[PDB]
Every structure is written in structure tokens, then in C-alpha cells.
A paper describes a structure:
Aberrant activity of dual-specificity tyrosine phosphorylation-regulated kinases (DYRKs) has been linked to neurological disorders, diabetes, and cancer. DYRKs belong to a larger family of CMGC kinases, which includes cyclin-dependent kinases (C), mitogen-activated protein kinases (M), glycogen synthase kinases (G), and CDC-like kinases (C). DYRK1B and DYRK1A kinases share a sequence identity of 85% among the catalytic domain residues.
In our work, we provide the first crystal structure of DYRK1B in complex with AZ191, which will facilitate the future development of selective inhibitors. The kinase crystallized in the C222_1_ space group, featuring a single molecule per asymmetric unit. AZ191 exemplifies an ATP mimetic kinase inhibitor and, accordingly, is located at the putative ATP binding site of DYRK1B ([Fig fig4]). The methyl-pyrrolopyridine group penetrates deep into the pocket toward the catalytic Lys140. This moiety is stabilized by a direct hydrogen bond with the side chain aminium of Lys140, π-stacking interactions with the sidechains of the gatekeeper residues Phe190 and Phe122, and hydrophobic interactions contributed primarily by the sidechains of Val125 and Val258. However, what is characteristic of AZ191, however, is that the methylpiperazine contributes to affinity by forming a hydrogen bond with the sidechain carboxyl of Asp199. In the DYRK1B structure, the manganese ion coordinates the side chains of Asp239 and Asp259, reorienting them away from the ATP binding pocket.
Numbering used by the authors: 88 to 381, 395 to 434
The structure:
Amino acid sequence: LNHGYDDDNHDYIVRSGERWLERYEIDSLIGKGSFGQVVKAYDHQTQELVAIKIIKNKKAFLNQAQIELRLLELMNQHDTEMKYYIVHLKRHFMFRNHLCLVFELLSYNLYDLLRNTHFRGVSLNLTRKLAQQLCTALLFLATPELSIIHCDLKPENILLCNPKRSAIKIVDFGSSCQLGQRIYQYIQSRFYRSPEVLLGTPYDLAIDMWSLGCILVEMHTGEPLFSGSNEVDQMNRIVEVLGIPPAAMLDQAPKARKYFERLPGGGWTLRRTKELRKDYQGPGTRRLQEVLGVGHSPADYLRFQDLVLRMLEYEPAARISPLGALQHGFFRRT
Ligand SMILES: COc1cc(N2CCN(C)CC2)ccc1Nc1nccc(-c2cn(C)c3cnccc23)n1
Ligand SMILES: [Mn+2]
Ligand SMILES: [Mn+2]
Ligand SMILES: [Mn+2]
């Protein structure tokens, strides 16, 4: 607790109506997370609402947000069209021992959109609109000069610009890194965590595409595709849909043995611990066709499933690229 401004988690104690810097009036809490808090604030100088991300008062979180700041400014440097899929940082300042990042205020997040459907999912047409924008934001991050791995793609970090419009932007580069410059082994939110991160292998921009494949299914069905309770359970649920990962991946995977075991002359198989639910039927027995259930032709559903399976390829080299996804027949008349 610093002068009484911080709670026990080193989060700033948000008080509605408080005035900061004789400029910002705090209205309400938007969200909490590992990083800290996001608040809705009124900028009295410009007479506009903003969102303010208040980083936790910890050396570690302060240090990690230096990176997030640098990456946000990098993504704003040039006059590109693609950069407008990113919520852009208006400014940053220090306030009572907290680094504060000011963003344009958006309306709500993709989890809110799903809850408004009673978690039944959105139409295939809206899933398509959202997916093509998300693929484009990934194409942008893959630009060589950026080479940014978002590392925390998930519904909470995908915001709708306007309540009656399907435009989206992405937020939360607080765990992002650039290619090769990976600096954490336990990354991504668990439901959206890729096999290579689960397996401890070197990861690259493809981990975001894995997340995106998970998200598109959730958008359509209303529910997370792989809602694991821990990493072993996360692997188990992935394997139940997509089968055993390829031997070339498991052979070079430091944590292969956390989930899998070797059969003499039988390759790799899932370790059968008590973490496995009793009704578990085997690898690939929860077909994606049945998860999806029974612009909306049955051919459109088959194209959607095809795109999702290319996003959920185990081998990152084999997983569809942002450009490949954009050229996929799910989106394109040709
Ligand atoms: C009223 O505005 C919002 C309301 C909500 N909520 C979410 C809960 N439901 C129940 C209500 C609606 C969610 C987002 C917004 N707006 C908004 N606009 C800009 C940035 C951010 C932002 C969110 N996150 C996780 C971030 C992480 N890093 C940086 C920036 C952000 N959020
Ligand atoms: Mn700056
Ligand atoms: Mn995050
Ligand atoms: Mn459903």
C-alpha cells in the first residue's frame, strides 16, 4: 500500500469521480487482469471518454509494460491501413506510482457479444465478418518490421468499436513480444494456449493463429472449444478433438512426457492419468463436426470447418498463415 493508494494486489484503488492531473475523471472499472486495471475515464480537456490502463505498482509489471508501450508506439509509426485494427495508445503518463496508458474508448468485448446471445453463438455471417478482421490484424502483426506475437488473443481482448456495428479492434499487448525475442514459457490464456506452448517448444506468430481458431469456434457455438482446468487437462481436451500430435513435434518437445508416453513400436499415446475424464473415448473422438453441431449454406459450414481445422494444425509450420486464412474460400467468392 503506497500512501494508501494501492490495495494488497498493488492495484490502484479506483474511486469513481476522482480527478487525475486536473484532466481525467475516473468513471468506473472496465476490467481487471494480471497487468492491473482498465477504467473508463472522461478527459475534460478534449471532452471525450477514454479508457485508461493502470499498470500494477510492481517493478515486474512496470518493466513488462515498457515493452507494451514500445510495441504500441511501433505499430503506430507508419501510414498503413491495417494498423486501424489495433486500439491505439493516445498517451502514457505516470500517476501515483502507476504507469497509465490512455486509449480511445471502445464499446465492449467479444465475450459481452456472446453473453448477449445467451452464449448460443453468433450467426455464421457475423462469425465471418469478425474472423476476416481478426485474420487481417494477424497479417498486420506478421509484417516483418513488427513481427509481433500478441500472446494473449482471447474474447476479452477483442473489442467492438460500436454497439450496432461489427467493426473490431484488438487490445492487450502487455504480454506481447517480437519474433525470436520470446521471454516467457507460460504464455497465452489457457483455453487459447497453443500446443507448442503447452509442449514447451519454440513458438512464433503461429500461436496467435491457434488462439484465433479457438475463438472462431467459440463465436459460432457460444462456448470455449477447449476449456481445460490446467495444462494437462488442456492437452487432453485438444487431443480429444484433434488426435495425437505428430511424432516430429513430440520428439523435440521438452514437455512431451507431461502429457504423452511412448509405446514400444507404437509411437506416442496420451498418458492415462486420473486427470482424464471417465467418459473419455480416445483421441479424435470429439469430432469438430459435432462440436459445431447441427451466407449460411451447408457448403458455407463445410468451408468454415475447413478453415478452423487449418488454424488448429498442430505443427506451427503447417498451421495456416494470416494471408492463407484471408484467401480461404470461407471468405472469398473465388
Ligand atoms: C466501456 O468500455 C468497455 C467495457 C467493457 N466491458 C467488459 C466487461 N463487460 C461485462 C462490460 C463491458 C470492455 C471494454 C471496454 N472498453 C475498452 N476500450 C478501450 C480499451 C479497453 C481495454 C480492455 N482491456 C481488456 C484492455 C487491455 N489493455 C488495454 C486496453 C484494454 N476497453
Ligand atoms: Mn512515449
Ligand atoms: Mn493479457
Ligand atoms: Mn452451442
